Amino acid sequence: TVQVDIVTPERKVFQGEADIVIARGVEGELGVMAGHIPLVTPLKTAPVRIKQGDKETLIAVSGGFLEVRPDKVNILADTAELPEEIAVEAAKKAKARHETILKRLDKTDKDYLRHKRALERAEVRLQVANSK
Amino acid sequence: PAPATTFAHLDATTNLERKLAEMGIYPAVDPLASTSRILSPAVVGEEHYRVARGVQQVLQRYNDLQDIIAILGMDELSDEDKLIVARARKIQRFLSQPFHVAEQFTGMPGKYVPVKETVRGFKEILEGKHDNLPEEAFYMVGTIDEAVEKAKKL
Amino acid sequence: PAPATTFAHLDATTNLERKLAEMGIYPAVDPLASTSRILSPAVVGEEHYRVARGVQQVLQRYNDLQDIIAILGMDELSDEDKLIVARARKIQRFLSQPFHVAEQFTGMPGKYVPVKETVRGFKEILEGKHDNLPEEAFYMVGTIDEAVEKAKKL
Amino acid sequence: PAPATTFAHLDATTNLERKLAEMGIYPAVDPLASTSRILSPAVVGEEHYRVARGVQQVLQRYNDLQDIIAILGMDELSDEDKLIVARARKIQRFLSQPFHVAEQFTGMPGKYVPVKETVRGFKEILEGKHDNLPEEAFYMVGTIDEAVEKAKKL
Amino acid sequence: QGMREIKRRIRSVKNTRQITKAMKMVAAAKLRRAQETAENARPYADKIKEVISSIAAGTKDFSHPMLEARPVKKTGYMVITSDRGLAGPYNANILRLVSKTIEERHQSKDEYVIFAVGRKGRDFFKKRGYPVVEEVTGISDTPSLTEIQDIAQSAIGMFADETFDKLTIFYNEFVSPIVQRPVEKQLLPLTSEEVLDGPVSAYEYEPDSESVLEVLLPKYAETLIYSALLDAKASEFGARMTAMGNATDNATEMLETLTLQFNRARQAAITQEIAEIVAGANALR
Amino acid sequence: SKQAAAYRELSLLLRRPPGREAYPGDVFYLHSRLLERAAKLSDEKGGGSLTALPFIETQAGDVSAYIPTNVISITDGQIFLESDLFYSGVRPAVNVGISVSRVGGAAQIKAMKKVAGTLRLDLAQYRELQAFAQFGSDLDKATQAKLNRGERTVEILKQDEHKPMPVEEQVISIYAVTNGFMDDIPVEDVRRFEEELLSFMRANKDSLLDHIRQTGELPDTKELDAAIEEFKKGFTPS
């Protein structure tokens, strides 16, 4: 196994030894196990899946990056939540807000990236909430 | 001793207070200290008693907050207490009424309000149906319909 | 009853107060309770009257804020009241004065301030002309010029 | 006038506190509120007075930190306070005592503790000789030797 | 005086003492929480610094616009204040420093822009006609980085496209629960000495070191703004402890004074009442 | 109060000297001579008793007025009522903090004495820590649960007019709220939860009630816990 920490600026979200850490990198899906080469990569706003034998745990991560060592695996992100600690109604209202604004906006715009990233944060929070 | 001894001889008491009269709330009737032997569900019905008791609890809570608000400020309260303060002041003004015999003091025509109409008016204020009307709209009117009409003038 | 009945027999009254004496404000004259029949434009002139009532208006508002200031200090006051309190405290100290008879107690030599200088000094304080000067500069001096001079060695 | 005239003759006060009785601290004498005119180096010795005042200062400090401890926690306290809090809790338990009259309530036999033993016991706690003993050892015993004797049984 | 008037006041001051005492504890709890949140934000920032300094250590002729100083046409000013009051001179002190600094440094409003973090500052700046470009209010007592991310990214973005050429931040620096000091700290441009001195380590980068660096440098600037917020929050709640601790001590002083006045009037009332009854009885006999 | 004033009338008309509030020097003696005749006799004297419930009407809460001061000191305890509590809906409007019974536990059966210890502790801490009540969800979990427990016990202590409860039904209602069987149920449903619980206990689980009637003690606690939990599943909140 390898020790894994999923952390935000304000708190530690996940702590434990994992068999494999499945994270969606900007270039592709990483499958980080023990004895991996030292690596740093940005992550897409997506669920981070941690397998501890029989147990699977999804963490909704947005605006984060991965830092691998052979000894340790770190994920620092803007937001990270386990299924139980996600506000579901807030995510639905956030989804409906940002998606309806985004529909009347081209890519050449000041506020396009802000709404699209906020929409991705909302949808990933809903995906991880439904797994519970 | 005189008014204290008199209390034993009464079935209903209308307790006037100067602090209400000093604001312009007429008739200056104390909504808590005024009492009646027939204020119960058996006589006036379950709705009347519940609305009457609801008015007293809102006005009681407003009095408990007045000394706290005065020094420490309005914005330090919770959202529940801020809503209670807003409705209490509207309830207190809707308890006021212009009298037929007091036209020379009020400067407006007097109003008669039926009981079923009165109960309906204060019920809608407790439920929160007139939260967007200003305070002066509730002041010196008959029915709750007249308060809706008065708010348009302001 | 004794001092109460005495008031009828007086054209002017100097009302001394223990609170001012314990603060070091001598003579300990209450500036609002002390009255005079000849404080009017006809006798003392328009400028004297206007400045006198201007001083009393500042001190009256300062008096109204004492319950709040005692608990919370001057932090929760509005920008307007902060200025009024600041001017009131300077006015309060410029109202004090060292006496010729009190040389034995205090050690400071006594001062005689003409009416023109008194009217001029409190006028300049009301106009914000000495807002920059610290409070102790106004305490125990004669003219406003002596307060300007005292502020330098302070 | 009734208590004021009575207090003119009093030499001490024994103030019983309900909160100490709820904790099991009998006799429930408030060690800070209870006072005596003869607590001085003249009547009792220099050592008695030093130890008594030391106990008061330690118990007063512990009483002041109750609000800080309850919310912030023990880590908020400095290294000096942590030791004072530990000794204060030992001191508060050593102030309790089994009574000859209250054998039915407590179960244990009663104890008469001389002044010299009382002074010596609280002196040794303030000096830090018994810091390593558990807090239950100081509860419901006579002399300081009985507290040390209780420690082996725990 | 009048007993009814005094006993009304005793009830008012006793309740006001209870709330001020309670708000000291509520503030003190939030002080601890702000410091505990800062203990997580510091290693988070140090980790990002470690990767940035590692990239720079293994790059020939390393340079980036955020690390480079340039002539200052305009300057951005982030100012942290509280939303709520009852924090002593906390807001007054920091706004005094901003007023003094701007008057001495600048001769016109066109030379700078203000990001108003907090309601008390926003109202101060708007009332006196200061150039408030952006604002944020309703920040929670234990704030996340997300609650200031939009205004921080906007402020960082305005430096990147040369809308202004410098960014500093004003806040009350936490020393202790009693002591909080107004300060000005530079955010952009970043100082190369304090950012590139992290521990160097060999990492592979995906897609590459430039792409990772382009994400982490603005992200590091966000955490500097967030760390200033958490420290300003610690100063706010500490200032509220002291102010409401004083208000509690002042309330107990006044409550004693009112209790003396009450018992003076109570004793005087009974003395007068009984004297009039006995005087009335003696007149008959 | 009205008896005292009537004796004052006669004393003043007979020209006996007036004192505080014009009362004579034997008005204390009047009430003490009355109230001491109420007593609990010994076994040798037959064992009978007279219980007294004297009234005093205070004026604007002035408990330190002369006639109130007399009757307070004479009696074995006081049930202080207040207008603030009455207008809020706490009825009966009993101020528990200042009210006293010097007889205390001796006047209770063993079941009531055991459950009431936690009740007086919980209710004291609630009204003491009521300043934190407006500050919702900012507090630590220690003071959070005590406020939730405290406001629920207040609803049990509320009671309708002319509806006195048997002691066996009181102890089960107090046992339920103090041990935390109403923490799950909302605050507005506590009074309805009580009425339906005692209806359930009277009909089905009468053996637990009858044990308290006969022995004057609590039944098997784990059996009582099981009986309440069966009802709690059948109950529908709102």
User: Which one of C22, C66, C71, C76 would you mutate to disrupt binding with E, by most E Cβ within 10 Å of its Cβ?
Assistant: C71
| Helices within chain D (DSSP H only) | 2-7, 18-23, 46-64, 66-71, 79-94, 103-106, 115-127, 135-138, 144-153
Do residues D112 and D40 touch, judged by C-beta distance below 8 A? no
Q: Which helix (H) or strand (E) holds C121?
A: helix C115-126
Q: What is the DSSP string of A62-128?
A: EEEEEEE-SSEEEEEEEEEE-GGG--HHHHHHHHHHHHHHHTT--SSSTTHHHHHHHHHHHHHHHHH
Q: Among residues A76, A37, A78, which one has the least CA distance to residue E201? A: A37
Q: How far is E86 from chain C (nearest CA, A)?
A: 7
Chain D adjacent subunits, 3+ CB pairs under 8 A = E
Residues of D in contact with E29 (CB under 8 A): 71-72
CB proximity list for D76: less than 8 A, separation 6 or greater: D68, D69, E32
Three-class DSSP labels, chain E: CCCHHHHHHHHHHHHHHHHHHHHHHHHHHHHHHHHHHHHHHHHHHHHHHHHHHHHHHCCCCCCCCCCCCCCCCCEEEEEECCCCCCCCCHHHHHHHHHHHHHHHHCCCHHHEEEEEECHHHHHHHHHCCCCEEEEECCCCCCCCHHHHHHHHHHHHHHHHCCCCCCEEEEEEEECCCCCEEEEEEEEECCCHHHHCCCCCCCCEECCCHHHHHHHHHHHHHHHHHHHHHHHHHHHHHHHHHHHHHHHHHHHHHHHHHHHHHHHHHHHHHHHHHHHHHHHHHHHHC
Crossing angle (nearest 10°) for helices B115-127 and B144-153: 60
Judge contact between D45 and D123, C-beta under 8 A: no
Kindly list the residues from chain A whose CB atom is less than 8 angstroms away from the CB atom of residue E40. Answer: 7-12
Q: CA A14, CA A60: separation in Å to the nearest integer?
A: 11
Q: Any CB–CB contact under 8 A between B154 and chain C?
A: no
| Cβ pair B73:C68 closer than 8 A | no
Does E28 reach chain D within 8 Å, measured CB to CB?
yes
What is the C-alpha to C-alpha distance for residues F117 and F178, in angstroms, rounded to an integer? 10
Q: Is the dihedral of CA A92, A95, A101, A103 positive or negative?
A: negative
Residue E38: both structure tokens together: 């800062």
Instruction: Identify which of D66, B72, B70, D62 has the alpha carbon closest to the alpha carbon of residue E23.
Output: B72
Which is the catalytic residue, given F20, F33, F102, F127?
A: F102
The chains in contact with chain C, meaning 3 or more Cβ pairs closer than 8 Å, are: B, E
d(CA E178, CA E183): 16
- CB-CB neighbours of A132 under 10 Å: 10
E38 to chain A: closest CA residue: A10
Q: Which two tokens stand for residue C19?
A: 């609170």
Query: CA of D127: how far to CAs of C139, D64, D120, F21, F39, in Å?
Result: 52, 22, 10, 60, 56
Positive or negative torsion for Cα E86, E89, E90, E95: positive
Taking CA atoms, F93 is separated from F96, F120, F157, F188, F195, in Å, by 9, 16, 10, 19, 20
Give the span between the Cα atoms of D122 and D129, in whole angstroms.
10
- How close C61 comes to chain E (CA, Å)? 20
A37, E215: Cβ pair inside 8 Å?
no
Residue F57: how many CA atoms within 13 Å on its side-chain side? 10
DSSP secondary-structure letter at B12? E
Verify whether residue F152 is a known catalytic residue: no
Element (H, E) at B42: helix B41-44
Q: Rounded distance, CA C87 to CA C57, Å? A: 11
Residue E34 CB neighbour total at 10 angstroms: 23
Contact yes or no for A26/A42 (Cβ under 8 A): yes
CATH of domain B39-154: 1.10.1140.10
Is E85 close to B72, i.e. CB distance below 8 A? no
* Cβ within 8 Å, pair E22-F135: yes
Between positions 47 and 106 of C, the ones with CB within 8 A of B are: 67-68, 71-72, 76
Residue A47's nearest CA partner among A116, A128, A102, A105 is: A128
Backbone phi and psi for residue C130, each to the nearest 5 degrees, phi listed first: -125, 35
The Cα-based distances of B43 to B32, B46, B47, B49 in angstroms read 19, 9, 11, 9
**In angstroms, rounded to a whole number, what is the distance separating the alpha carbons of residues E58 and E72?**
31
The Cα C16–Cα C26 span in angstroms is 9
CA A78/CA E223 separation, integer angstroms: 10
3-state secondary structure F63-117: CCCHHHHHHHHHCCEECCECHHHHHHCCCCCECCCCCEECCHHHHCCHHHHHHHH
- What are the C-alpha distances in Å from F123 to residues B76, D67, E168, F130, F156? 26, 20, 53, 11, 11
The type of residue at D147 is A
| E25: chain D residues, CB-CB within 8 Å | 67, 70-71
Scan residues 26-55 of E and list those with Cβ closer than 8 Å to F.
Answer: 26, 29-30
* Cross-strand pairs, A14: A6
In the structure, how many helices (H) and strands (E) does chain F have?
A: 10, 2
Q: Which residues contact F228 (CB under 8 A, 6 or more apart)?
A: F176, F181, F197
- Of E144, E204, E211, nearest to A39 by CB-CB distance is E204
Helix, strand, coil % in chain F, rounded to nearest 5: 55, 5, 40
Q: What is the DSSP letter of F159?
A: -
Task: Look at the alpha carbons of F63, F69, F71, F74 in this order and tell me if their dihedral is positive or negative.
Answer: positive
The domain that contains F181 carries what CATH number?
Answer: 1.20.150.20
E134: Cβ–Cβ under 8 A, 6 or more apart, which residues?
E115, E116, E151, E154, E155
Whether chain B lies against chain F with 3 or more Cβ pairs closer than 8 A is: yes
Helices C115-126, C79-94: axis angle to 10 degrees equals: 160
Residue with tokens 């008065």: B150
For residue E12, give how far its alpha carbon lies from the nearest alpha carbon of chain B (Å).
5
Distance from CA of B78 to the nearest CA of F (A): 6
Show contacts of E25-29: CB within 8 Å, 24+ apart.
Answer: E25/D67, E25/D70, E25/D71, E26/F132, E26/F135, E26/F138, E27/E237, E27/E238, E27/E240, E27/E241, E27/E244, E28/D68, E28/D71, E28/D72, E28/E177, E28/E237, E28/E241, E29/D71, E29/D72, E29/F138, E29/F140
Nearest to E85 among C70, C71, C76 (CB): C76
Amino acid at F85: L
Of the candidates B68, B73, B75, which has its C-beta nearest E15's C-beta?
Answer: B68
Q: Please, are residues D19 and D45 in contact by the beta-carbon 8 Å criterion? A: no
Nearest residue, CB atoms, E37 vs list A10, A40, A41: A10
C-to-E residue pairs, Cβ atoms closer than 8 angstroms:
25
Distance CA C126, CA E252 (A): 35
Residue with tokens 């309790």: D96
Say if B101 is an interface residue toward chain F (CB within 8 Å). no
Tokens describing residue A68: 């691998």
Element (H, E) at A5: strand A2-7
Considering only CA atoms, give the Rg of chain D. 17
For chain D, the farthest-separated pair of C-alpha atoms sits apart, in whole angstroms, at 55
Cross-chain residue pair E20–B67, CB shorter than 8 Å:
no
Residues F1 and F55: beta-carbon distance below 8 Å: yes
C100: three-class secondary structure by DSSP: coil
Side-chain half-sphere of E262: how many Cα atoms within 13 Å?
Answer: 14
> Token pair 């005086």 is at which residue?
E1
How far apart are the C-alpha atoms of E185 and C8, rounded to whole Å? 68
CA distance A54 to A46: 22
Partners of F87 on chain B (C-beta within 8 Å) are 32, 56-57, 60
Count the neighbouring beta carbons within 10 Å of the beta carbon of residue C82.
Answer: 14
Contact assignment for E29 to D76 by CB distance below 8 Å: no
Using alpha carbons only, how large is chain F's radius of gyration in Å? 23
- Judge whether E215 is closer than 8 Å to chain A, CB to CB: yes
Amino acid at D106: T
Tokens of F130: 């009521």
Phi, psi of E212 (to 5 degrees): -70, -45
- Cα–Cα distance measured from residue D87 to residue D130, given in angstroms and rounded to the nearest whole number: 9
CA nearest neighbour of F31 among F13, F10, F49, F52: F52
How far is B16 from B27, CA to CA, in rounded Å?
8
Determine the residue of chain E that is closest to F13 in CA distance.
Answer: E281
